[PDB]
Amino acid sequence: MIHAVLIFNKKCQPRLVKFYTPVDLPKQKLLLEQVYELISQRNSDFQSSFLVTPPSLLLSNENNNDEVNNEDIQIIYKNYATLYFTFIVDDQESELAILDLIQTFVESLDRCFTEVNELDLIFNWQTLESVLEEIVQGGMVIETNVNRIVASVDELNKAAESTDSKIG
Amino acid sequence: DLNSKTNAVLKLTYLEMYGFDMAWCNFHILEVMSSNKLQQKRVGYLAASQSFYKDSDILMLATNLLKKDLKYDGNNDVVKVGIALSGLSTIITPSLARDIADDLFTMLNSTRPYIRKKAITALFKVFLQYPEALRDNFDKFVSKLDDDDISVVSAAVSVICELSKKNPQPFIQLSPLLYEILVTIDNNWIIIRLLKLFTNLSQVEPKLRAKLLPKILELMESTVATSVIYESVNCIVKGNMLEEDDFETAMACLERLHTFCDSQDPNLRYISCILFYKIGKINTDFISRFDQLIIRLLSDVDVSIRSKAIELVEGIVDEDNLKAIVQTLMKQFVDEDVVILQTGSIVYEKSKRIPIIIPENYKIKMVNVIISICSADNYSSVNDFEWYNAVIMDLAMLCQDISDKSLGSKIGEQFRNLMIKVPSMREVTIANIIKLISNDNINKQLPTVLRECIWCLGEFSTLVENGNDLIKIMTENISYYSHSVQEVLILALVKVFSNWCNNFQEDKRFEIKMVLKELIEFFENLSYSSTFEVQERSVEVLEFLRLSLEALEEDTEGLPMLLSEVLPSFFNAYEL
Amino acid sequence: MYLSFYITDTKNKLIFQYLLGATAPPQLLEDSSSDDYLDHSMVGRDLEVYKYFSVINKLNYWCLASTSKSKGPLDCFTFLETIDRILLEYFDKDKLSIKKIVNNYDRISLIFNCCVEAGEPNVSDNELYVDLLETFHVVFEKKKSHLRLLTGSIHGIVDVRSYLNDNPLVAVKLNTMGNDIGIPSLHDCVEINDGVFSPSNITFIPPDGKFRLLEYSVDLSSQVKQSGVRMNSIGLMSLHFQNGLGKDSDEFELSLNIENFKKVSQVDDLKIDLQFNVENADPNEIAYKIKILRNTHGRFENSIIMGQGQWIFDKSTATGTVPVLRGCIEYENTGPNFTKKVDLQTVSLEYSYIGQSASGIYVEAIDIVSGLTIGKNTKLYKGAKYKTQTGNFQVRL
Amino acid sequence: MVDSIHRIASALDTAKVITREAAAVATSKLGESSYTYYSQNINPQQLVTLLNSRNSREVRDAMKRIISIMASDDDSIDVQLYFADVVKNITTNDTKVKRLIHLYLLRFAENDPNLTLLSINSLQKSLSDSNSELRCFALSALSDMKMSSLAPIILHTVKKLVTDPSAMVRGEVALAIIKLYRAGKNDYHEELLDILKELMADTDPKVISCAVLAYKECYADHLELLHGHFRRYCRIIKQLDSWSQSYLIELLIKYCKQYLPKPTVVDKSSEGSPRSCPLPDKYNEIEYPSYEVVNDPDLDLFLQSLNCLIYSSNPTVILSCCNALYQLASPLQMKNTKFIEALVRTVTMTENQGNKEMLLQAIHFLSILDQTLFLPYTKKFYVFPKDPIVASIWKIQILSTLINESNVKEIFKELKYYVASAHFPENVVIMAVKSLSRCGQLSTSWESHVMKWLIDHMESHNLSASVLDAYVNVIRMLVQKNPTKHLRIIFKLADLLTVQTSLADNARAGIVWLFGEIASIEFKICPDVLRRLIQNFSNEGPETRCQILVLSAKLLSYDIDNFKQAQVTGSEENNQNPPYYDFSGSRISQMYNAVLYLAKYDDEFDIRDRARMISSLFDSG
């Protein structure tokens, strides 16, 4: 189960966090901070993409890849052009499941937001969210098909636009 | 106004996320969920799903509302249905579950894959709470599990998986269907999941594991991914599926790992390396196929990889392999080592100079390995014994930097063994030892090495002509030494002098006499150690020596005999 | 070679470190909660690095030195002390608490450097007021109704704050109230030349700065015996714990007469901490209740939980007046596991006075010497202030 | 290890406080950026120019910075010129300047001999100036130079500066004369003496602290001179700041180790004489002998001083003094009672731990050298409750030192009472053992009570392996001093071993040895013990086996002579019997044979080797 997804821009700013389960918000915040931190230390070429960590590397510093861990929490990072997507999963969700979901998410985002910028993501946080949800649901990514996702997003955009002061 | 509603909802959601009375917000969220706009419905639903936990009245209301929305055509019907279901699923009560199931059941039969997916996911969450509902809905799942749409199937599966986590018994019932779906899926993520599910069912039910294993490995063979490959491997290694019947599966999985390890990505590498090792502990044959892979990983800079390799090297060694490995490690460590010994830098590629890199614990492990390698078979086959001897001396040096004393101990023991074996090399070893001792660096930290050296020399003093320099070394260094060492040195020296005195006759030579005298003075000094035992041990030796001297003064020929005569006498007197 | 100095708090946390020069890289520490405890560590490798350590605790700060190889341990201890003092003068004076250190950690480093610059450790070395502060501490042993001063230690510091214009000299005459006053210890700005200055006299040269003029430690056991002093006031505080107890109660009477304090100047804050051993008896065993303790001029607050009394006497009670602190201890037990025994243990009373003499060093006269005459313009100030502390009175029963 | 350690350290350091000097600029005021200038190049020009400016104040600033840059090895930085300029500026009449300049000089010398020489010349010129404040500092630097070539200079100066009447100058001329001898010794000693003398006789604490730090050096070698000089030093210490006192301690320690003027015949006839005291021969006051050291106002003054310092309320001065008092002492010095009383007083005064431990230790060291002194203080060191395992351990060591015969009972009572009573940790029990051991070494009458106490603890408790190792070592020591109580001690231990077939390797080792050792006293019985051991050796650890051997061996011997004549067997002479002959080759042999065989089966060589020899020698009679 993905318990949360965080999308950050290249300058480490969080932009979206989704939490599929309740977890305590203070914990989520802390985690998001630590993950950000490591990300910063990791190089742009590394950007790590991931930080799995035994807890003890939670942070431990001595070999600075000390990764981050928090025990029971694996952190998967993905860098695309300019956004970073971090997915925090419980120890019971598989890394691949998390990666796939990420990859699919990213592809969709790129298709929908061909150029995503940070500002466009913010405003359209709901749109980004919707896509993320659809993908996720019943734990399940149920359409996997990038063409279906792309359509769905267009449908949602049409809705929100139709509503927009309730939205904008 | 709809835009205002959206705002209210945002605020309520933020309040519910805090840990606030959700019951009070429910009424409002319920009204918003009745707004025709689909976005507002979605946000409302999200809130209620966050809120419902515990309050049953609220839940009941929220349910009624969601139901209405599900029934309404809805025309963005997919989205509305979709959200509502998620929503309902995240609500759990037995009453609600009862309602929801009926709704979900209907929605499972909608055409649109989006809806079907959501519906499935919902029934998952529901079942996560209420088993009776499951029982009733169990049938539908079975029908849905058979829909043509890969995303729907994937969902059905995940759901059955969760339900196994909570109920395994019902699903050990459906396992066959799951096995039939996995056999029909094209999609990698779907395959990956199905694989996990079976792993989950395996912890409960080995029978399933058997049926599914072969479904895994066929799927890995058809998917490329990479994750499906890793997965099959992790599942194989996990369920402990493996058991041996499953070796064949493991093999395929390994072969796929080896192909991948052989991709440049550290994530895939590490994962493979680990999986390899684990398998190797379990299956040496596989390892022999994967030595090459290991050696290549040794040149990788990633500490987890390195450590994983060294651990692999220990169970693989062949002679050609040994020599290669040894040299490679020795070289690496002169070039890979330092970083964490010095700090703890994170790794870099770039410095062209490279920060360089091994932890302290890696170093210790390396040395330990080397020693084992030299002693296995027995490496009667380092062909070049010279290299070993060198390596050992080298390690000792670097470790002096580490301490951890234990490194230093293990190394010493090994050296002793090498010397005992390979009579050639002895002379080389002795010379080096003597030099290392007179180089203070061994004295620092290293009492064990000193103790060993002491032993080696008493034994081999017979090889060495100049048993004088050795002994003048040792005598000068005795004052710098720990009590254990002092005890050892004392004991050795005495063991030696006995050998010399047997050979002295050259003249008796005056030198032997002087050397004895020196040893005596020293031991007297050690008779003043704070530990009574040691003190007594030294005093005994002092007397022993003094004797030999007297004997030499009065004789030469009679010295060996005299020593066996006098020494015991003294010893008994003291003890007596 | 490198030297390094570190300063740690009582809770082993490093507060300051300094490295001088060069290339530079559990039982005692565990114990340091006790205040006295760290002793040496050898970081050691043959780079002899030697280490050494020394630690100094002053005013809650611990100072650790290291040296590299040679210098000797004692040399490192001397450098540590001078550093400590400098830290007191610099920061003005009153405290170097960990909090202060931390905030001033750098100010400490700067000092260290100066000491080393000068090359050498530089070595390590109109109105007048004399404010004698005295902290007594006395270990009494009760035997038979009378408390016999078994040990004690009165520590006097004598500070003096001046306002001359130049540097005249001061003679201070201390009086013995036949207690040979024997060792006054004098501050680096002070001289006590040899019996020229008599044993009762002290000569001090200005600093502008507050200066501790003389510290005096008098071991009460011999003094009191020599002088006959059952402290009738001060220090001998007589606590009478009456057993004849019932299973829950007991009564103890403590009187702190201040007959011998008339010229002892004000007592700024007498604090009495009575410990009822509850450490070895489990506070449930010792539920004790202190019912009434009556001071005529102070305040009592009980801490049962913790197993303690604290009684704080405010400075107004001064002369002849005798604050009597009576009261009753009732050991309430909810367990049966209390056997009605509370080993009654040690009641430490710490007094602080102001303006009086630790040994009886009451300064009876202070005179000025420089070719000066009386009313050549020299006046008497107010508000030197000394402090004195030892450890602590103890009355055993 | 070291890497990580240093890494962390540095980090914290530098960072605090805002890198030293970069923070030094940041907090300057408008003109607060100076720091960053000289930090970010003040520059040599700024320095040189500032030195060539003729104003004593400007020379100061320039001197300060200069000193830093020189220290940094900014290498770029002629230090020769600064050196030169600074040397000329040394001749300025300002004290602050002279001070800095002296500091600088000492720096350069650390790197460069020529400059070292110049700096020395300058110091000579200024030393010949009438200004005593300068002539002083100047002479000081000459002393921190390390060099032997600078001696002929430094001397001519030192001579002129002693011959100056000034107290300041007299302080410094000592520092020099000292750091001088430390190097070019002969040409210089005649003068360097008649000098240091007139000096020491100064009044100013900053002059005394200096001659001290001096005399401490020159004399390492020329101690006859030092004496007549060392006196005022000890007198002075009594009158002085607590810092100036600790210093005098370090010296008084060194001097003594050097002038013990030798005992050589010690004129005990000097006056009122202690061992006697010389005065120096070259002064010839009726040569007053050497041991000067204990009598002579110099040494004696030292001891008395040390005391006052300890009485002086400063714990440092107290610990340090204790160390010095331990070294001088002809034991006649510590018997002083004062040293002890002072220590004990400190102990109770001390609040601080580094101290408590030090105190408890001191008391031990002093008891060692002097027990009879601590006796009135024992009841004082009955343990303080608050204290840890190490403290309770130290209290035990003290009791062990204080034992008189009349007091001993009082002590033992406290101990035994502790072992049984306290919930004493195993570690404490270990020490309590080492003590009681050392106690009996001194008393014989009380030894029995001690041993019995020990054994009773061992026989009974299944004691821990560490404890067993200790006890075994102790029992061994006592047996070594009191062989009469020894026999019982052995039998008692034998039984314990025979029961414990499980014992620890180190225990078996001790237990066995003790029995080798005691066998002389009653090696009639020892065969019984050795028998059990052998029988059970085969199931034991190596070290244990080794000890078991040597101790079979010894046991065998002691009794060869006693066995042999007894063993030279069925020689009749042995069935004849004095006392030991002992049933000898048979009883002992039967034991050794078993032992040897058993040792051979152990891995350790030393065990086997000894076992082999033992058998050979034994066998041959």
Side-chain angles (χ1 to χ4, degrees), chain D residues 446-461:
Chain D
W446 293 121
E447 182 274 332
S448 294
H449 291 80
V450 170
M451 178 277 293
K452 179 62 169 62
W453 292 154
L454 297 171
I455 295 299
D456 287 347
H457 284 313
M458 294 175 72
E459 185 175 359
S460 295
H461 294 288

Side-chain angles (χ1 to χ4, degrees), chain C residues 15 17-19 24-25 28 31-37 39 45 57 62 74-75 77-78 81-82 85 105-106 117-120 122-125 150-151 153 155 183 185-186 188 191-194 215 217 219 390-391, chain D residues 2 6 9 13 16 18 67 99 103 107 140 144 175 205 209 213 238-244 246-247 250 253 311-314 316 320 323 345 349-358 380 384 387-388 390-391:
Chain C
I15 311 301
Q17 182 268 328
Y18 184 32
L19 164 65
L28 302 182
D31 281 347
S32 72
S33 64
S34 292
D35 288 345
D36 297 291
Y37 273 60
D39 293 315
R45 288 184 67 188
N57 183 32
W62 298 68
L74 292 174
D75 192 61
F77 186 76
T78 51
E81 186 177 302
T82 298
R85 286 181 182 276
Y105 161 119
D106 288 345
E117 291 292 309
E120 189 176 0
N122 194 32
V123 173
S124 65
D125 285 349
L150 184 63
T151 66
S153 178
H155 182 53
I183 303 174
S185 175
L186 291 63
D188 289 346
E191 296 178 355
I192 181 166
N193 287 346
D194 56 344
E215 61 180 58
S217 297
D219 180 349
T390 67
Chain D
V2 189
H6 303 198
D13 215 297
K16 203 241 229 168
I18 317 319
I67 288 170
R99 180 63 178 167
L103 294 172
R107 294 294 184 188
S140 180
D144 290 318
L175 295 174
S209 180
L213 294 173
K238 292 180 180 179
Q239 301 300 304
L240 295 186
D241 68 60
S242 67
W243 288 107
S244 293
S246 294
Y247 286 150
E250 182 178 302
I253 294 168
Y311 295 148
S312 176
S313 67
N314 189 309
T316 300
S320 295
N323 286 340
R345 289 181 183 277
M349 291 187 286
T350 56
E351 294 180 355
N352 186 276
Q353 290 177 331
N355 288 338
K356 290 179 180 178
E357 184 176 359
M358 295 300 97
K380 294 295 183 181
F384 289 118
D387 287 8
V390 173

Side-chain angles (χ1 to χ4, degrees), chain B residues 30 79 174 252 269 316 349 352 407 410 496-497 556 564:
Chain B
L30 296 164
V79 173
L174 300 186
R269 289 179 177 173
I316 67 171
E349 295 180 355
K352 290 180 180 179
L407 184 57
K410 291 294 183 181
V496 174
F497 282 93
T556 60
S564 68

Side-chain angles (χ1 to χ4, degrees), chain B residues 287 290-299 309 312-313 316:
Chain B
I287 278 296
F290 302 114
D291 187 58
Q292 291 177 332
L293 192 54
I294 296 167
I295 292 168
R296 289 179 181 173
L297 293 172
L298 280 167
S299 67
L312 276 71
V313 157
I316 67 171

Side-chain angles (χ1 to χ4, degrees), chain A residues 100 137-138 142 163 165-166, chain B residues 2-3 37 117-118 121 189:
Chain A
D100 287 343
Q137 69 176 336
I142 64 170
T163 62
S165 68
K166 291 180 180 179
Chain B
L2 275 56
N3 288 280
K37 187 175 180 180
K117 182 176 179 180
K118 289 293 183 182
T121 299
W189 288 122

